[PDB]
Design a protein around this ligand. Sequence first.
Ligand SMILES: CCC(=O)Nc1cccc(-c2c(-c3ccc(N4CCN(C)CC4)cc3)[nH]c3ncnc(OC(C)C)c23)c1
Length: 310
Amino acid sequence: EAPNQALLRILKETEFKKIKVLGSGAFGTVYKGLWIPEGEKVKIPVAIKELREATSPKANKEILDEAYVMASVDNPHVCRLLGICLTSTVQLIMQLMPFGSLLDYVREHKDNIGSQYLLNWCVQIAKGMNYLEDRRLVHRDLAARNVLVKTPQHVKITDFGLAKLLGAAAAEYHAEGGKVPIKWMALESILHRIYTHQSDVWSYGVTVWELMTFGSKPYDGIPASEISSILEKGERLPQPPICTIDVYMIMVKCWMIDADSRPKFRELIIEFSKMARDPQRYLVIQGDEFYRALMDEEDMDDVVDADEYL
Ligand SMILES: CCC(=O)Nc1cccc(-c2c(-c3ccc(N4CCN(C)CC4)cc3)[nH]c3ncnc(OC(C)C)c23)c1
């Protein structure tokens, strides 16, 4: 396999500003802030994840593993790592996705979300996953909650917490016993802890169903324990009301038992691109037809998105 010559930038703490707290937890804390590289007339909006405890070796190995993965894949439609900071508590510096997770977005703006946006998001998530397949990366946790909103027009995959790089000449990843989201997993992942690009496709299909339902929960009210049996008996998620047969047939194909009978992300890109050219022909939706405050700072002249920084 090819040498992985990704670059990992180490950042000084003095060259970023934590402005606000987006979220906290036992994992750590995620700040909103600005990164000003010393000597460059540039200010980069960032999300900064800092560990709560500096003394957990397991937490430090996992955070660096996440950094390794993200640095090894740099692209649009993938949330970008800018660097890490090796302070008392390790910090990941990431590109700020101001509008949160797509799952929250469709739930808060269902009434104002049209077919054009829904299909473009589907195209974008496909381009992202097709890039990850090129990098021999298997995401293992694709879900509407793990796609974030840069702008309403532009979404990006993230939470590479469970993402695993495939070894050279290997097409499957055999995982150990661990907490994993059953409702988004392919049947072979559930029964045999097997993950591939094609199991990623299964999850893509569930992700699209979340979007097409405006944020509903798959198999709501059903224990994850009987999911395996439901899938084996041939059940699948139902057709969402706005979805023409054309769209739903794509989703269904994603949920075949034979992983090689599921589409490839390249084909999902093409097919959703076609539908994005005439969106109201494929989704029937009722009624279809400078932000310095965001950064809580006044001087925004030299602001540059990470997607333009190198
Ligand atoms: C627990 C998993 C998770 O992604 N947590 C989390 C918590 C807080 C913010 C973000 C986040 C956000 C983010 C999340 C929520 C919001 N909203 C919430 C809804 N509200 C109405 C407006 C503000 C805005 C931005 N943007 C990010 N960009 C890059 N990395 C991130 O997190 C990475 C470093 C883990 C994040 C993510």
